[PDB]
Amino acid sequence: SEVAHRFKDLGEENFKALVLIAFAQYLQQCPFEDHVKLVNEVTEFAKTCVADESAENCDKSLHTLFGDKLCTVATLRETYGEMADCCAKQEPERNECFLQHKDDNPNLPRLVRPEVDVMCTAFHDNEETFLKKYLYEIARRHPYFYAPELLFFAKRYKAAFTECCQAADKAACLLPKLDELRDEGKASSAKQRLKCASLQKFGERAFKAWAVARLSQRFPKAEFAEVSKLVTDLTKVHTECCHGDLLECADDRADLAKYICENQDSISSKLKECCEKPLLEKSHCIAEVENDEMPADLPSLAADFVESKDVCKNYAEAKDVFLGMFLYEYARRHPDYSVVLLLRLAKTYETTLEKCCAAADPHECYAKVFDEFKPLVEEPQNLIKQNCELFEQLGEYKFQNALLVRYTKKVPQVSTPTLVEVSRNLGKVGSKCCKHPEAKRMPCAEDYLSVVLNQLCVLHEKTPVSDRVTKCCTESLVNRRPCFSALEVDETYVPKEFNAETFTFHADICTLSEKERQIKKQTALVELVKHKPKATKEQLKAVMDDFAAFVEKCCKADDKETCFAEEGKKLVAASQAA
Numbered sequence: 001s002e003v004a005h006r007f008k009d010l011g012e013e014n015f016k017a018l019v020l021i022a023f024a025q026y027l028q029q030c031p032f033e034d035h036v037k038l039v040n041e042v043t044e045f046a047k048t049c050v051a052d053e054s055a056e057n058c059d060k061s062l063h064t065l066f067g068d069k070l071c072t073v074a075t076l077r078e079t080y081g082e083m084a085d086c087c088a089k090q091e092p093e094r095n096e097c098f099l100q101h102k103d104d105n106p107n108l109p110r111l112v113r114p115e116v117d118v119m120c121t122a123f124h125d126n127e128e129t130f131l132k133k134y135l136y137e138i139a140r141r142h143p144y145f146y147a148p149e150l151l152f153f154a155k156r157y158k159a160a161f162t163e164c165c166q167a168a169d170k171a172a173c174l175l176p177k178l179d180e181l182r183d184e185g186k187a188s189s190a191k192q193r194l195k196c197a198s199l200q201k202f203g204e205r206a207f208k209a210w211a212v213a214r215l216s217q218r219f220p221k222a223e224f225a226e227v228s229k230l231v232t233d234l235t236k237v238h239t240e241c242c243h244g245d246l247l248e249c250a251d252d253r254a255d256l257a258k259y260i261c262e263n264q265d266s267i268s269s270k271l272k273e274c275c276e277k278p279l280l281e282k283s284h285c286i287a288e289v290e291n292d293e294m295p296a297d298l299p300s301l302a303a304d305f306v307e308s309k310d311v312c313k314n315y316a317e318a319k320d321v322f323l324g325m326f327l328y329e330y331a332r333r334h335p336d337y338s339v340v341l342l343l344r345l346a347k348t349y350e351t352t353l354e355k356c357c358a359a360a361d362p363h364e365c366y367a368k369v370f371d372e373f374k375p376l377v378e379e380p381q382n383l384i385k386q387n388c389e390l391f392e393q394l395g396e397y398k399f400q401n402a403l404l405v406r407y408t409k410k411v412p413q414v415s416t417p418t419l420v421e422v423s424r425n426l427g428k429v430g431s432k433c434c435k436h437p438e439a440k441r442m443p444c445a446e447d448y449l450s451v452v453l454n455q456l457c458v459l460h461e462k463t464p465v466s467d468r469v470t471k472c473c474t475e476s477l478v479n480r481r482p483c484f485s486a487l488e489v490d491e492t493y494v495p496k497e498f499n500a501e502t503f504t505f506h507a508d509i510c511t512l513s514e515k516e517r518q519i520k521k522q523t524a525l526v527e528l529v530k531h532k533p534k535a536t537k538e539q540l541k542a543v544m545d546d547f548a549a550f551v552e553k554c555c556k557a558d559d560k561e562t563c564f565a566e567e568g569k570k571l572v573a574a575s576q577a578a
């Protein structure tokens with residue numbers, strides 16, 4: 001009985017929280033109350049199985065059990081409508097369906113967060129509910145969020161509230177802690193979506209390719225066979241989490257943590273304080289530990305991968321393991337390299353070994369391999385140092401408008417919200433990456449944009465509108481940022497003439513955050529660019545200066561939306577002629 005095998009392995013709390021995530025993530029419009037109802041039933045059931053694994057229903061699959069339970073609520077199609085299809089389906093099709101129906105951008109209201117004392121009061125008046133609601137709200141909104149990490153977050157969310165409510169000033173303590181979690185959570189969700197993306201479209205071999213490069217960057221001193229082992233184990237974990245098997249995800253991640261911790265010596269010099277931490281922390285720690293030192297004096301790549309006379313033999317026995325070896329050997333020698341690049345280098349190799357083995361003479365052509373890299377390597381190098389001067393001039397905000405305009409004109413089919421969000425995240429590279437020296441710049445950007453461009457691809461995959469976006473996304477997972485960095489301004493676009501409510505703001509806007517304010521400013525900007533893509537210089541500064549500065553006028557105008565209904569009409573004439 002797997003349900004009992006999971007229960008006993010993780011325990012009731014995590015079992016209960018991993019379940020609630022499972023559901024939250026599967027029927028996303030469903031109310032908190034309902035899920036918790038469902039979760040305790042499943043809980044009720046598990047205990048029996050633990051108590052008697054022979055009992056009536058304890059042999060079914062976890063999907064089966066969770067699927068029947070879920071569909072108790074989903075069945076209504078006046079409330080839901082589209083998930084009730086998955087209900088009439090049986091396994092394994094029912095699970096395929098729920099996963100297909102996972103909505104990366106769900107039309108959901110934001111929890112206007114109440115004052116600090118009420119949260120504190122709620123936290124004490126009943127925390128068990130309070131904390132359940134944190135898993136629920138994040139899961140709902142992040143249907144691919146790495147669940148076993150989402151628990152690690154929860155514990156930390158619990159800790160903040162217990163510290164900060166008892167503190168003299170409850171707000172100055174709590175608010176910074178919360179916002180730190182939020183950010184740390186948005187990066188996590190994003191990073192995790194890339195893994196599910198990779199796994200479910202480009203197959204595991206591609207995920208495998210990514211981890212081996214990554215783990216070997218981190219664990220250079222480890223053997224190759226020791227890295228493949230870890231890679232395989234990781235893959236089964238992410239496969240399982242990205243397939244909705246969250247319970248065995250948590251278990252298998254836990255096994256690996258223990259495994260790593262028991263062979264510390266054979267894997268890394270740098271895991272001492274990581275592997276002394278408790279359950280949940282232990283895995284977050286290990287995952288994000290620092291790069292180990294490089295084994296004294298290493299040989300050249302060439303000898304094995306070039307100068308040797310038995311490439312094709314080692315290739316043709318098993319090209320995957322060989323290419324895995326190259327991916328190992330190349331990466332352990334270069335922690336200063338981006339992982340997308342390396343994957344781009346290794347692929348040149350794969351293709352070139354099929355070009356050269358297929359000849360009568362193997363050697364002559366593949367001796368020239370390590371020139372073919374120089375241009376692939378220099379392409380990312382040039383783009384990053386080009387944008388960074390262009391950033392420190394403008395600042396994170398101004399520099400996001402430079403992106404907005406560009407990507408807007410580049411791909412005007414896309415929805416303004418998508419454009420606004422992706423370009424807002426794309427320019428955040430300039431903050432975290434240009435800050436470094438070159439020794440860590442180019443890589444930093446190139447890898448971050450890998451995450452931010454996936455966001456674009458999965459948001460566009462929802463409702464396709466463009467021809468070119470759907471290309472860069474589906475053509476080759478690692479060739480993405482250079483693919484979007486080869487799309488010129490389009491000449492096909494038929495622009496929508498005028499939309500008067502887009503550029504006329506309101507008095508609700510004088511009661512919201514600077515971030516939200518910025519996001520409004522920028523939405524209007526995108527949609528103005530959407531009016532004239534062709535001849536349009538900096539001048540988009542001025543009229544955006546106006547739609548932003550005139551806000552200052554009307555906020556500090558002490559009226560009942562009089563000036564908004566006329567002094568905004570002054571500017572629609574300003575944005576057409578000029």
Ligand SMILES: O=C(O)C[C@@H]1c2ccccc2C[C@H]1NC(=O)c1cc2cc(F)ccc2[nH]1
Nearest residue numbers: 205206208209212228231320323324343346
């Ligand atoms: O060629 C592909 O697109 C599939 C995968 C890919 C992805 C990027 C760069 C190279 C390659 C080659 C290809 N994967 C592998 O060759 C491969 C990696 C790998 C890692 C291991 F720990 C054990 C065996 C392995 N085989």
Ligand SMILES: O=C(O)C[C@@H]1c2ccccc2C[C@H]1NC(=O)c1cc2cc(F)ccc2[nH]1
Nearest residue numbers: 194195198207210211214215218234286287
């Ligand atoms: O995969 C994990 O959850 C943790 C992995 C781990 C564990 C111990 C030491 C180092 C590391 C690195 C850490 N994996 C990654 O960073 C990683 C990123 C990433 C992005 C992809 F698009 C596809 C596969 C990927 N793996």
